Design a protein around this ligand. Structure first.
Ligand SMILES: [Cl-]
Ligand SMILES: [Cl-]
Ligand SMILES: [Cl-]
Length: 163
């Protein structure tokens, strides 16, 4: 575990992370996809061997010795608000199990279901709170990656406000 487990946020490409493992915002079929999933495919393509996994689950595949945890958030275009919320909470609980199993001291994580799976809604607070519910009991250093300047400020404020 990390000596003083922390949350941090960075505004940059998660493909350039400085952590011991990465969470992919995957699709259920293990396809290259778009956004975070596409950048992960370009950086760790070997990790997409047998990566297909259902909504609300996480599956780790090693790229050399570097773990890629494929976490499948719901597409809120397809799910009701209620069922989507349950599956989004579940995907993050499976991330916490994988991070613990791997024994890593740090993990890079995107906000699941906030991009093209958001069903056109702002889900920063919803996705972040489910991330916290899952990861709070882990002792890894968590580094959240985002691309938008106003999302970086809002994530940073939510972190510091618990400290
Ligand atoms: Cl960048
Ligand atoms: Cl997404
Ligand atoms: Cl973002």
């Amino acid at each position: 575990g990390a000596m003083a487990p922390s949350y941090r946020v960075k505004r940059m490409d998660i493909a350039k992370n400085d952590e011991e493992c990465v969470v992919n915002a995957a699709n259920p079929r293990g396809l290259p996809g778009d956004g975070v999933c596409k950048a992960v495919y370009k950086k760790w393509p070997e990790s997409f061997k047998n990566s297909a996994t259902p909504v609300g689950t996480a599956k780790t595949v090693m790229c050399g010795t570097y773990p890629v945890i494929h976490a499948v958030g719901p597409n809120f275009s397809n799910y009701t608000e209620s069922e989507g919320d349950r599956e989004l909470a579940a995907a993050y609980r499976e991330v916490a199990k994988e991070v613990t199993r791997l024994g890593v001291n740090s993990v890079a994580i995107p906000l699941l279901s906030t991009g093209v799976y958001s069903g056109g809604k702002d889900r920063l607070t919803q996705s972040l709170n489910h991330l916290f519910t899952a990861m709070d009991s882990t002792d890894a250093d968590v580094v959240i990656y985002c691309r938008d300047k106003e999302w970086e400020k809002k994530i940073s404020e939510a972190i510091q406000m618990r400290t």
